[PDB]
Scaffold this active site. Structure first.
Site, short mmCIF file in Angstrom:
data_model
loop_
_atom_site.label_atom_id
_atom_site.label_comp_id
_atom_site.label_asym_id
_atom_site.label_seq_id
_atom_site.Cartn_x
_atom_site.Cartn_y
_atom_site.Cartn_z
N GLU A 1 -1.97 -5.21 -2.21
CA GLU A 1 -1.71 -6.38 -1.37
C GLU A 1 -2.52 -7.62 -1.73
O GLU A 1 -3.02 -8.33 -0.85
CB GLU A 1 -1.84 -6.02 0.12
CG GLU A 1 -0.76 -5.04 0.59
CD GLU A 1 -0.71 -4.87 2.10
OE1 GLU A 1 -0.87 -5.87 2.85
OE2 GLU A 1 -0.48 -3.71 2.55
N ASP B 1 -8.55 0.00 4.12
CA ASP B 1 -7.38 -0.66 4.72
C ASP B 1 -7.65 -0.88 6.19
O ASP B 1 -8.44 -0.14 6.81
CB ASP B 1 -6.12 0.21 4.54
CG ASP B 1 -4.82 -0.57 4.68
OD1 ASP B 1 -4.64 -1.24 5.72
OD2 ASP B 1 -3.97 -0.52 3.76
N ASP C 1 -1.72 3.75 7.91
CA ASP C 1 -0.48 4.04 7.18
C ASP C 1 -0.09 5.55 7.21
O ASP C 1 0.35 6.11 6.20
CB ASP C 1 -0.56 3.54 5.73
CG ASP C 1 -0.66 2.02 5.62
OD1 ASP C 1 -0.29 1.32 6.58
OD2 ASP C 1 -1.10 1.53 4.56
N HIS D 1 0.80 -1.22 0.00
CA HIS D 1 0.00 0.00 0.00
C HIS D 1 0.85 1.29 0.00
O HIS D 1 0.37 2.35 -0.41
CB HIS D 1 -1.06 -0.02 1.12
CG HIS D 1 -2.31 0.74 0.78
ND1 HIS D 1 -3.43 0.74 1.58
CD2 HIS D 1 -2.61 1.52 -0.29
CE1 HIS D 1 -4.38 1.47 1.02
NE2 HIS D 1 -3.90 1.96 -0.11
N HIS E 1 6.06 1.27 4.68
CA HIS E 1 4.71 0.74 4.50
C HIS E 1 3.64 1.54 5.24
O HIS E 1 2.53 1.72 4.74
CB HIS E 1 4.68 -0.72 4.96
CG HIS E 1 3.46 -1.47 4.54
ND1 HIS E 1 3.24 -2.79 4.89
CD2 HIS E 1 2.39 -1.10 3.79
CE1 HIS E 1 2.09 -3.19 4.38
NE2 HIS E 1 1.56 -2.19 3.71
N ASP F 1 -6.07 -6.46 2.30
CA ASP F 1 -5.94 -6.82 3.72
C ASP F 1 -7.08 -6.29 4.62
O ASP F 1 -7.19 -6.66 5.79
CB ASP F 1 -4.53 -6.50 4.28
CG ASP F 1 -4.39 -5.08 4.88
OD1 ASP F 1 -5.24 -4.18 4.64
OD2 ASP F 1 -3.38 -4.85 5.60
N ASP G 1 -7.11 -1.82 -0.34
CA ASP G 1 -6.15 -2.81 0.08
C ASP G 1 -6.93 -4.02 0.50
O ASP G 1 -7.83 -3.93 1.33
CB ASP G 1 -5.35 -2.32 1.28
CG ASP G 1 -4.19 -3.24 1.60
OD1 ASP G 1 -4.44 -4.41 1.96
OD2 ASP G 1 -3.03 -2.79 1.48
N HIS H 1 -5.25 -0.57 8.11
CA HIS H 1 -4.21 0.29 8.65
C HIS H 1 -4.31 1.71 8.12
O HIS H 1 -4.60 1.92 6.95
CB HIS H 1 -2.83 -0.25 8.26
CG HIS H 1 -2.68 -1.71 8.50
ND1 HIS H 1 -2.91 -2.30 9.73
CD2 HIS H 1 -2.31 -2.72 7.67
CE1 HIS H 1 -2.69 -3.59 9.65
NE2 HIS H 1 -2.32 -3.88 8.40
#
Length: 272
Positions: A250, A111, A115, A88, A128, A216, A214, A113
């Site tokens: 991802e 996501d 980030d 990402h 990341h 994930d 993403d 996350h």
């Protein structure tokens, strides 16, 4: 309301495809799996450079600049740029190119996350969890010169958050960034969540949309988005006609290729 047809794209509809395996083989597998044909079956024309198109900061900058350029190339032509990613952090590039071409775009970031770590809060060190911190512009300048802060904090919205992985819960609140975590998805349902997200970054439905997705954030204990929810996000965005850029990140090669494929088709206008 949203326009009956896209106010941004080129009259011969073109899907730009940029794969970057930085981190896997997922972008290649997806490409092998018939994504190109799916896109064409939906009335899109495909601009793909062929299957050769695809800390450590020194190298993280190089690849993201590469992506930023290729994305703009497609962007500066009325294409919808589909970035098939590994990591990402590649959103540093994808968002730079897109906003370079659409300074008035907004960004929907899907996501687990945030980030959003500065290199002064990273601790882990992997670039990341830093790409948003560069796009928002607080870098810290060194070998990340090509990056201009092209993203205002009121132009980004997060959907699917659960583990603040290098995405400080303080940074998010200091810059007043709208976040819809899994708690809010549970609370309100993805239906209302996507509408509130659109109303925050795009109240008049006139801004181009960058959807940076993403995988994930998804699920096949069981605390991520369902596939249906990841799909609805792509559909809901698709119905607006505002989408100009799509990242599918991802991907990671089991039936996460078929999932990625489904979300692409969907984001591009498979209504079904």
């Amino acid at each position: 309301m949203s326009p009956a047809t896209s106010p941004f794209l080129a009259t011969p509809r073109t899907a730009g495809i940029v794969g970057c395996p930085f981190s896997h083989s997922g972008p290649l597998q997806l490409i092998e799996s018939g994504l190109l044909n799916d896109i064409e079956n939906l009335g899109w024309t495909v601009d793909f450079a062929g299957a050769d198109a695809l800390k450590q900061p020194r190298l993280v900058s190089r690849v993201t600049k590469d992506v930023a350029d290729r994305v703009y190339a497609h962007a500066s032509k009325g294409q919808l740029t589909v970035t098939l990613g590994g990591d990402h952090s590649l959103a540093m590039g994808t968002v730079s190119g897109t906003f370079k071409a659409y300074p008035e775009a907004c960004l929907i970031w899907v996501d687990a996350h945030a980030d959003i770590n500065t290199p002064h809060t990273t601790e882990s060190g992997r670039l990341h969890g830093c790409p948003v911190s560069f796009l928002l512009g607080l870098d810290g300048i060194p070998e990340f010169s090509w990056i201009k802060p092209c993203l205002k904090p009121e132009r980004i919205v997060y959907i699917g958050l659960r583990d603040i992985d290098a995405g400080e819960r303080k940074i998010l609140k200091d810059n007043n960034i709208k976040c819809f975590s899994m708690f809010h998805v549970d609370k309100y349902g993805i239906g209302k969540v996507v509408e509130m997200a659109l109303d925050h970054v795009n109240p008049d439905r006139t801004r181009p949309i960058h959807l940076s997705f993403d995988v994930d954030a998804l699920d096949p204990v069981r605390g991520g988005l369902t596939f249906r929810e990841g799909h609805y996000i792509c559909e809901a965005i698709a119905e607006t006609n505002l989408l100009v850029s799509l990242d599918i990140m991802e991907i990671n090669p089991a039936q996460t290729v078929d999932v990625g494929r489904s979300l692409v088709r969907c984001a591009l206008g498979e209504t079904l």
